[PDB]
Every structure is written in structure tokens, then in C-alpha cells.
Amino acid sequence: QVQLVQSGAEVKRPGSSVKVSCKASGDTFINYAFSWVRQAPGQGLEWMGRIIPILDIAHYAQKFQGRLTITADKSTDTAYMELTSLKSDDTAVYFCARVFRGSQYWFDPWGQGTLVTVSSASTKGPSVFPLAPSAALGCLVKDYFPEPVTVSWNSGALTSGVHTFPAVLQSSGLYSLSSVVTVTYICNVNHKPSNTKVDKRVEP
Amino acid sequence: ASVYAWNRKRISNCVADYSVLYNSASFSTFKCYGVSPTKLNDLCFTNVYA
Amino acid sequence: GNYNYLYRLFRKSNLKPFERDISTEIYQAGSTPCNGVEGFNCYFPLQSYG
Amino acid sequence: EIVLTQSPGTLSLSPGERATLSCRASQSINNRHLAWYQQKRGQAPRFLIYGAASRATGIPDRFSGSGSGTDFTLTISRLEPEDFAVYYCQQYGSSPPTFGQGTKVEIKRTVAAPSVFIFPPSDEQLKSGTASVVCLLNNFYPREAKVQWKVDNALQSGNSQESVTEQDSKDSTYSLSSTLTLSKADYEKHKVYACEVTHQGLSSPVTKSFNR
């Protein structure tokens, strides 16, 4: 019933002032507090802070006492979050929770989360490479920072049995993923923000 | 019963206790309009409905 | 709605003349100890006028 | 009150047995203030139990917990395939709310065998400087695997083990891989690039060894 709608992911640079919103629909906005919890990749959760809309007071953590700035607009029913001096290890999924107005509370409702990527160098697109085997074959695209890139084999033809390997951070600093499917071998790479609809052929 | 045929049953001439309902930890909502959620064991009424 | 004005709705005892209570503790209602948490039988003392 | 450590960490349980997830207390939780959640793959956590004893409205009756002062459990009976996610612990008995690392419950499938497939670098990679050697390990149930790389006369690691992760497929089969990154001329000026893996319940055979 508490639909905590958030915004989308924002590609920022190391050092900025992010502003994530959280639409708090359903019941009233003043009868419930709100807290933001970060989720680092494979590192559980971490309680950053909490805001009390009826009292307009915040309670930050020891590691965010002075850097985090969590507000809440009591008119549009939207909670905000702001953090100054963003370092490299800030690429986490920030969730929006609606905690109670007490000293001790639990996180009953949650949000979709925002994958705010802070560490960014540029917006270079990938580069397809037709790695042929010695019909097991794939298309390896690397050196792409935004990483919305989905590898659609022939626009869905060879997708029957394909394994979309999750992208891992390369040693250079950009993401890299692969997709190998065995048996038309035109792997259609789709990069949405860069508009890179490149196509390559691989032969066994 | 259903919503269109809600059957009420009046209960009078009794010593009714409301502590088994408020302090039960089993009901979802206990919004008491008008009267307070507590101190209801000191209000003697004529006849109540359900 | 201007929610910048509050009034203490719940209190354990009556207030003394010319006394100021700015605490925001959880009101102990019913019989279950709240121990700082909110929810059933645990209401917030302050309420907005709207 | 500050530290929560999940004892199992991982649990490969059959789809229909009983599970037990532990969360040991650190600083003598006072009033049993602990909460359980279910963070599914790429989704938001779901509140399951508050106070470690009482359930939430809407949670199935299979979810239950027990614990008084220093150790809490989570008794789930007849785990459905939908209940295979990561479960976290949250304590609210102290001032700073803390969490744990999470316990991932995976499907208990039969042991499988991978297929070592080595992909020689492409023609463009041999003329640019980004020659890659992909070694894919598909259709294997035991996720525990340490793929070795014989890029030189010895088992030299280098940058081949970039560790592209995987995920639990529909048939409970994982798919690991590993790609190389070296010069355009360093590939030919080397020995046979082999790919072996010491799989749990198998051996480490050299397959698809492509000679330069």
C-alpha cells in the first residue's frame, strides 16, 4: 500500500552532489518517518540516516555525520537525499524505507532503488570482437562505462539457450561482459545511451 | 455475514470486559473513534451493538 | 496544509501550571511495554494540526 | 547489538526440506529486537518477521523464528522455489541499526560436468593489442571452482581470471568464463594457452588447447 516510488539511475562523476527523490504515496507523509539504506554490491546493507517529517530532525550515522543531507518535502510527499564529497566507493543501490517515528524501528516498506554510479571516467562505447573457436561462439564487448548494454543475438534469434554473463569491472576501469551461444550469427549489440547498434559476425 | 446483510446482535445487561480485545495482540486495526482506546472499562453504557 | 504546529495528544499524567514538556517519548498505552518502538498500543505523543 | 554474522552463509537445500538460518548476537540484544528480510535477485527486501517471534500480515505460515538473548534462528518449512533468495538480519535493540552479510539459499541439483571451450583471439585483436582468450565453463552445479590458466610454461595467472560471475539458471546450472587481455604479439610469442579447472568431483583436463 505504501508505494515508495523513486527516480532512475544517475551517471555521476567522482565528486558531486546527488539528489535522489522518493515519492511517498498511499497513506499520510507526516505520520511515518523515512530512512535511506545503501546496498554495496555483495556487501549487505548499511543504515545511513533517518528523517522525521513531523519534527524536521535528522539522525545521521558516524560515517555520515557531516556529509549526508537527507531532507523531506512535506508538501509533495517526497523524501530527498544529498551527499557531498562523493568518493570512489559510493556505487551502491540507495533504497527508500518508511520507518516508524520511534527510537527503535524496522524497515517494513522499501523502494526500487537507484544504482547511482559515482566513479566514472568517460562515456566510451564498446568494441565487438569476433573471437572464433579452434557452433560454440560468442561476441565479447569491452570498454563501456554506462553498462546498459544488452547483447541480443540476431534480435532474439539465437537467444534460445544463450547465457548473459554479468558485466565485471575490468582492470582498465570500464565494464565488460560476454555472451556465448552454441548452435545466422549476427550478434546485435545494443547500447542505449550511446546509440551504438553495431553488428558483428562470428564463424566456428 | 456479507457486507450487504451485516447481522447485528445487541448485548445488554452484562459485565463486558474490553481488555481481552485491546490487549490481545491479534487484531490488525483497533481505531476507536470518539472514545479513547483505553479507559473504556469505566464507561457504563445502556446497550451496545456489534 | 501547514504542519508546523504540533500539540501533545497523549500524556501519562496531567500537566502542572506553567510547566513545559518538550519530550517526545513513546506513550505507553495498554499493557505491552513499547521499549521505544512504535505500532500497536504505542502512539506518538505529538500530532499535527493541519 | 552492532555486529550480526550469518552462520550458514550458503545453504544448498532440497526444494521442500527445512532450513535454519542463524544470526548470532554480539552485545546481548535486550528485548529480542531483531528483524528478518528477503532480498531477492535484483529486487527490494521483503519484511518477514519482527521481534524474532511474531510474523507480519501476509507472510506465509512456514516462516518462523526463535531466539532469546544471543542467537536467533529462522525456521522455514518446505521451501518453495520462490523462497530461494538472500535473507538478512537487522537488529533494532541499540541506537545504530546494523545489518549482516546475508544467506543465499540455492537449489540442490545433481553434480554436473563443465565443458572447456577455448576461443582463439580474433583477427582484429591480433592487430590492435587486445587479444582475448575466452574459456567458458558451462553446465556445472558446484559453483566452487578455481579455473587455472596455462598461459605460459607454468600456471601463470596474469589478467585472465577477471572472474565474470554467473547466476542460478532455470535448470540449476551455472556458467563461468574467463577472458585474456595481452598484446597482439604476446599471444604468438608464448607456449600453448591451456585452460584447466579443478572441479568439485572431477579432474582438471586440458581441452581445446589451441597452438599458435
Side-chain angles (χ1 to χ4, degrees), chain A, chain B, chain C, chain D residues 1-203 205-212:
Chain A
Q1 186 268 161
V2 188
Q3 301 294 337
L4 297 178
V5 184
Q6 304 181 200
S7 60
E10 45 182 352
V11 181
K12 304 299 295 299
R13 304 189 64 87
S16 59
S17 62
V18 294
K19 245 298 183 300
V20 186
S21 60
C22 174
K23 282 292 301 178
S25 60
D27 52 73
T28 58
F29 187 84
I30 60 178
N31 299 328
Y32 296 96
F34 292 89
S35 180
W36 290 75
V37 176
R38 59 167 63 258
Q39 176 179 141
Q43 269 289 342
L45 307 180
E46 176 67 24
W47 175 82
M48 293 183 297
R50 195 242 303 188
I51 187 63
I52 306 180
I54 184 180
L55 299 180
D56 297 328
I57 57 179
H59 298 270
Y60 307 93
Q62 299 292 340
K63 51 181 60 180
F64 293 99
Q65 186 69 208
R67 301 184 303 178
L68 186 61
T69 303
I70 166 181
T71 59
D73 181 71
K74 303 176 62 179
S75 180
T76 60
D77 305 334
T78 302
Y80 299 92
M81 181 183 60
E82 196 276 342
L83 215 171
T84 60
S85 300
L86 297 179
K87 56 185 60 180
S88 301
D89 48 84
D90 294 326
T91 308
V93 186
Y94 302 92
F95 291 91
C96 179
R98 184 213 63 167
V99 306
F100 290 88
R101 303 175 302 180
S103 60
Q104 313 297 148
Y105 47 83
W106 45 72
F107 308 89
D108 197 333
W110 291 83
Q112 56 181 1
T114 59
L115 185 59
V116 180
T117 159
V118 178
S119 60
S120 60
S122 61
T123 59
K124 181 181 179 300
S127 60
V128 199
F129 294 132
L131 288 86
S134 301
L137 44 82
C139 296
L140 175 60
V141 286
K142 61 180 62 61
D143 300 330
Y144 64 103
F145 234 112
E147 199 234 346
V149 179
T150 61
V151 184
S152 300
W153 278 86
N154 300 267
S155 300
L158 297 183
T159 50
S160 59
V162 71
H163 180 268
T164 301
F165 294 89
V168 70
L169 184 62
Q170 243 286 137
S171 301
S172 60
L174 301 87
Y175 299 89
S176 301
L177 102 167
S178 61
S179 297
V180 180
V181 55
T182 179
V183 179
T184 159
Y185 301 93
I186 306 298
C187 53
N188 181 269
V189 183
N190 297 269
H191 196 176
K192 288 84 180 60
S194 181
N195 298 326
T196 308
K197 306 301 180 181
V198 286
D199 300 325
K200 199 61 183 62
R201 187 200 75 262
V202 185
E203 294 291 339
Chain B
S2 300
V3 196
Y4 72 100
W6 50 279
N7 302 329
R8 62 168 55 182
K9 184 257 299 181
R10 55 175 299 273
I11 35 180
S12 61
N13 319 280
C14 72
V15 183
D17 54 84
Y18 305 94
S19 60
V20 302
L21 303 178
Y22 183 81
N23 300 270
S24 179
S26 299
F27 299 147
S28 300
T29 60
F30 212 92
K31 304 301 179 300
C32 294
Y33 306 94
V35 298
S36 61
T38 59
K39 296 299 180 300
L40 25 65
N41 287 12
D42 299 330
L43 300 180
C44 195
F45 297 97
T46 302
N47 58 90
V48 301
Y49 301 92
Chain C
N2 187 18
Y3 307 100
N4 293 269
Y5 303 98
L6 308 180
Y7 64 97
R8 199 171 190 89
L9 208 160
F10 299 93
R11 269 281 296 183
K12 301 182 83 287
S13 60
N14 297 20
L15 191 64
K16 299 184 286 82
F18 293 156
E19 186 67 23
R20 183 185 305 178
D21 188 8
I22 34 76
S23 60
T24 56
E25 81 292 340
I26 301 300
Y27 178 78
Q28 177 64 26
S31 59
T32 60
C34 302
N35 301 329
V37 313
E38 204 183 359
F40 194 71
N41 301 339
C42 304
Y43 308 96
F44 199 83
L46 301 181
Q47 183 68 210
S48 302
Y49 280 99
Chain D
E1 296 179 359
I2 309 298
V3 180
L4 291 181
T5 58
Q6 279 70 16
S7 301
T10 176
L11 181 60
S12 181
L13 189 66
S14 300
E17 296 292 338
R18 54 174 290 100
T20 299
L21 309 183
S22 179
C23 276
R24 304 182 303 268
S26 60
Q27 299 181 181
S28 181
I29 292 294
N30 192 270
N31 298 273
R32 302 159 54 94
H33 289 167
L34 192 71
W36 295 79
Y37 299 96
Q38 178 182 1
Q39 200 280 333
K40 292 173 267 64
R41 188 73 63 178
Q43 297 183 11
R46 180 199 305 177
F47 202 12
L48 301 179
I49 287 96
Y50 66 101
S54 55
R55 61 193 59 168
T57 59
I59 300 305
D61 302 70
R62 54 180 178 268
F63 298 91
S64 58
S66 59
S68 60
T70 336
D71 197 332
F72 304 90
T73 58
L74 180 63
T75 299
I76 306 179
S77 183
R78 276 82 280 268
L79 284 78
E80 285 75 13
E82 193 269 348
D83 299 326
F84 292 155
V86 186
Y87 301 89
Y88 292 93
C89 286
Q90 185 271 346
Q91 51 194 349
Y92 54 98
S94 183
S95 23
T98 59
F99 295 87
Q101 55 270 174
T103 302
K104 175 59 181 180
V105 181
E106 59 179 357
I107 311 180
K108 216 293 179 59
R109 205 61 179 90
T110 60
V111 184
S115 60
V116 182
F117 293 150
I118 298 181
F119 290 165
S122 64
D123 57 330
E124 206 282 335
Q125 286 180 340
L126 297 181
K127 300 179 300 180
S128 179
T130 58
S132 300
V133 180
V134 176
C135 178
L136 49 149
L137 289 314
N138 289 250
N139 300 121
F140 69 101
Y141 162 73
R143 59 175 59 181
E144 177 183 0
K146 36 264 179 298
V147 183
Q148 294 80 8
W149 270 95
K150 195 184 299 298
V151 301
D152 204 1
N153 59 90
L155 294 178
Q156 200 279 339
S157 61
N159 48 17
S160 56
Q161 29 66 61
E162 38 81 17
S163 180
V164 266
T165 60
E166 23 79 305
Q167 42 77 27
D168 198 331
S169 59
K170 186 61 180 60
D171 58 333
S172 303
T173 58
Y174 302 94
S175 298
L176 275 173
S177 180
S178 54
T179 178
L180 252 174
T181 30
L182 36 74
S183 179
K184 31 78 183 60
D186 186 70
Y187 179 81
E188 291 77 10
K189 192 180 59 59
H190 257 168
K191 265 59 77 281
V192 45
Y193 287 79
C195 182
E196 58 181 0
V197 45
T198 306
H199 189 59
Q200 299 292 151
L202 241 181
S203 179
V206 42
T207 311
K208 300 297 297 300
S209 60
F210 182 82
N211 300 330
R212 304 114 296 101

